Design a protein around this ligand. Structure first.
Ligand SMILES: CCCCCCCCCO
Ligand SMILES: [K+]
Ligand SMILES: [K+]
Ligand SMILES: [K+]
Ligand SMILES: [K+]
Ligand SMILES: [K+]
Ligand SMILES: [K+]
Ligand SMILES: [K+]
Lengths: 103, 212, 219
């Protein structure tokens, strides 16, 4: 199995970790800040998936500084993961075409 | 912070009936509200979570409705074990908070009180004390008047009463009247009477005892 | 079995301080939070603050003044609340509960009754209460026992060590000269008594004392 097929895989594993760790850290960072909504594990986990896929929903966002820093790690891990799958699929397609041309 | 408003504070329903407690939030909180039951002297018990999810170990007479800002805690065929204080709590925004609470009160058929007068204990007198206790158990309505007479004449000083919230077994009320005297004060009087005047009888229920 | 354990009571002098406890058992996660709730006699529930043991970070209610400090102890699974500079306004039952991080208090402790007074601990005096030889009877008999001259509250009263419940009333204490007094009453079928002993057990945590007292007829 090719490297790119591994990083793709690896990235997907790591993303799942960041989501969970993220849901967990968000709540810790947020409880204590008046009006915060990211304060129960389940909610934060959905908030987590949304952010990783770069989707926003209202004001379902962190209000504390660390909350946001966490938000940034989750967005970047998500955008790095998906773009890495994208790169892996592009190596697969670029390789098959080289075969199709008997190059 | 999210404000939880439980009104009315007291709810009077007849046995077997259905009952509905309301909780209103100062703003929309989805379904992030949970109900708790607290009987007299006990600690809070989780009845319903997330507005309508049933907890295990709770009679199926309990249900929850609502979303947004209006929530309802319902009980089908209310019964004595349901007499308590009900609280709602929200977990939509930090900090968590609770509503002021709602007291459940059941209206049963009238019941004359069982009375019992008790002479101070020997162990008591032995130490310089003298307490004449009397019990008005399981009466209803809760309005009752108790009178103390020492040797035919009315007494007051030294008397301390105590009432109980509606009972969670039969939905009745009970009172404790305790007239205290010094050994001497007691050592120099013949009889002591306890008179319970209650709505169920024009004539008062009396129980007495002489120190002889 | 009982998930959270708290000291029945704690006495404190106005101006002094006090650290309450709350140990756990059963399922416990690194994600669990322990809360603290204050309830003054006759009033509703009041959130004081929370803490997450496996980290030690705590948050407190800001609307009310901060008379507390939360801390925990990983090993013994015990959580502590440090209440300081108490006034009478701080007297109440303080519960601790457990939240899995999903918003609701699944399990609560029995709570710790705290009394802020200058007065000092006074164990309870228990005197039986049997009918008078003149009072007749019917299908049921009514006995009871008198707990009095103690400080502070509360006091637990059982009949036959809890095996006897049906027909029991424990009247609310009353304060008169830095001391409480209350009576509890049991009602068994006239037959069973006294051919089947009846005893009232009285515990008073403030002084760590639990006395017994069989109820027998007058001479
Ligand atoms: C990269 C951002 C740091 C990880 C989040 C830490 C949160 C600590 C809690 O306050
Ligand atoms: K996008
Ligand atoms: K968007
Ligand atoms: K988007
Ligand atoms: K959006
Ligand atoms: K939006
Ligand atoms: K993209
Ligand atoms: K080439």
């Amino acid at each position: 199995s090719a490297l790119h097929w591994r990083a793709a895989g690896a990235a997907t594993v790591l993303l799942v970790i960041v989501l969970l760790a993220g849901s967990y850290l968000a709540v810790l960072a947020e409880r204590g800040a008046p009006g915060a909504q990211l304060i129960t594990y389940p909610r934060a986990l959905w908030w987590s998936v949304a952010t990783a896929t770069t989707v926003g929903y209202g004001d379902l966002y962190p209000v504390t500084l660390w909350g946001r820093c966490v938000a940034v790690v989750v967005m970047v891990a998500g955008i790095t993961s998906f773009g890495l799958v994208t790169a892996a699929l592009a190596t697969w397609f670029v390789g098959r075409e080289q075969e199709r041309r008997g190059h | 912070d999210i404000l939880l408003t439980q009104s009315p504070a007291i709810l009077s329903v007849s046995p077997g009936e259905r009952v509905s407690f309301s909780c209103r939030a100062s703003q929309s909180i989805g379904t992030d509200i949970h109900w708790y039951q607290q009987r007299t002297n006990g600690s809070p018990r989780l009845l319903i979570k997330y507005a309508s999810e049933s907890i295990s170990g709770i009679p199926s007479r309990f249900s929850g409705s609502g979303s947004g800002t209006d929530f309802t805690l319902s009980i089908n065929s209310v019964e004595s074990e349901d007499i308590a204080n009900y609280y709602c709590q929200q977990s939509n925004r930090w900090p968590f908070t609770f509503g002021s609470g709602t007291k459940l009160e059941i209206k049963r058929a009238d019941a004359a009180p069982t009375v019992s007068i008790f002479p101070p204990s020997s162990e008591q007198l032995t130490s310089g004390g003298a307490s004449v206790v009397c019990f008005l158990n399981n009466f209803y309505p809760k309005d009752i008047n108790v009178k103390w007479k020492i040797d035919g004449s009315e007494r007051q000083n030294g008397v301390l009463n105590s009432w109980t919230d509606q009972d969670s077994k039969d939905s009745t009320y009970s009172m404790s009247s305790t007239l205290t005297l010094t050994k001497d004060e007691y050592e120099r009087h013949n009889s002591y009477t306890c008179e319970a005047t209650h709505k169920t009888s024009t004539s008062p229920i009396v129980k007495s005892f002489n120190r002889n | 079995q009982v998930q959270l354990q708290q000291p029945g009571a704690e006495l404190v002098k106005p101006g002094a301080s006090v650290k309450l406890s709350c140990k756990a058992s059963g399922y416990t996660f690194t994600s669990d939070w322990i809360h603290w709730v204050k309830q003054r006699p006759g009033h509703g529930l009041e959130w004081i603050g929370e803490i997450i043991p496996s980290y030690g970070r705590a948050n407190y209610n800001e609307k009310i003044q901060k008379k507390a400090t939360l801390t925990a102890d990983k090993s013994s699974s015990t959580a502590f609340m440090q209440l300081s500079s108490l006034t009478s306004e701080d007297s109440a039952v303080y519960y601790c509960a457990r939240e899995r991080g999903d918003g609701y208090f699944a399990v609560w402790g029995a709570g710790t009754t705290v009394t802020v007074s200058s007065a000092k601990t006074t164990p309870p005096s228990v005197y039986p209460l049997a009918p008078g030889s003149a009072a007749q009877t019917n299908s049921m008999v009514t006995l009871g026992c008198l707990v009095k001259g103690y400080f502070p509250e509360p006091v637990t009263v059982t009949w036959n060590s809890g095996s006897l419940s049906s027909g029991v009333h424990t009247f609310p204490a009353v304060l008169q000269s830095d001391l409480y007094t209350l009576s509890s009453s049991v009602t068994v079928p006239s037959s069973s008594w006294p051919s089947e002993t009846v005893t009232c057990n009285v515990a008073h945590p403030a002084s760590s004392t639990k006395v017994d007292k069989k109820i027998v007829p007058r001479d």
